[PDB]
Amino acid sequence: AVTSNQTGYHDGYFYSFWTDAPGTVSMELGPGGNYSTSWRNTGNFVAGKGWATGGRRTVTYSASFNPSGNAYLTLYGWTRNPLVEYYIVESWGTYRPTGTYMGTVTTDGGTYDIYKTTRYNAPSIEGTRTFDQYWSVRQSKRTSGTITAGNHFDAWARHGMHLGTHDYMIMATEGYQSSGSSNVTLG
């Protein structure tokens, strides 16, 4: 298992694992595009497989994701210059993420609400930093499908949410002060 912060490649896929609560979450790297997680009374973590360089790809996944508390099943990544953390949220637990509402985008058989938020003095790919988060949050839950990431990126940019140079992009599980499991397979 992965149980400490790291990135790398496994079976052809980039992966990232991060937590502020070492010991509360584990990630197993499965075959091909597969991984799984298990957490118990965690702080915050984000883990997943995907790509070292994000962009306008189509991301096809399916997942076991039936959380009891606060957690997200979400496309997730970063840009630099500007430094931005971004989310395309497919499902969630007790809490549906929200923020400053910008409008909607209709893609991949759903409609998503566009939100913007900001994290202050927070962990990032660039260390402790302040940075915006951009969100698309599906209006109803789903745990399999295709995400046309470009359709989100363009819609955000059309709403003045500017992305910089892409860093990593993963189909992520995120947990927060919760317990649970996920098993996610990138097609």
Ligand X SMILES: *[C@H]1OC[C@@H](O[C@@H]2OC[C@@H](O)[C@H](O)[C@H]2O)[C@H](O)[C@H]1F
**What amino acid positions are annotated as catalytic residues?**
85, 174
With contact defined as beta carbons under 8 Å apart, do 148 and 107 qualify? yes
Least distance in angstroms from the C-beta of 125 to ligand X: 5
Q: Does 176 bind ligand X (CB under 6 A)?
A: no
With contact defined as beta carbons under 8 Å apart, do 70 and 175 qualify? yes
Instruction: Give the interface segment with ligand X, choosing from 22-30, 98-106, 122-130, 152-160 (CB under 6 A).
Output: 122-130
Q: Which is nearer to ligand X, 5 or 143 (CB)?
A: 5
Q: Does 30 bind ligand X (CB under 6 A)?
A: no
Paired residues of 50 in beta bridges = 14, 170
Least distance in angstroms from the C-beta of 69 to ligand X: 17
**In a 3-state reduction of DSSP, which class is residue 43?**
coil
Other beta carbons within 10 angstroms of residue 103's beta carbon come to 12
Least distance in angstroms from the C-beta of 175 to ligand X: 11
With contact defined as beta carbons under 8 Å apart, do 112 and 105 qualify? yes
Q: Does 16 bind ligand X (CB under 6 A)?
A: yes
**Total residues binding ligand X (CB under 6 A):** 11
Q: Does 122 bind ligand X (CB under 6 A)?
A: yes
Cis peptide preceding 82, ω within 30 of 0: yes
Pairing of the two strands 165-176 and 110-122: unpaired
Contacts with ligand X by CB under 6 A lie at 16, 18, 44, 46, 85, 119, 122-125, 133
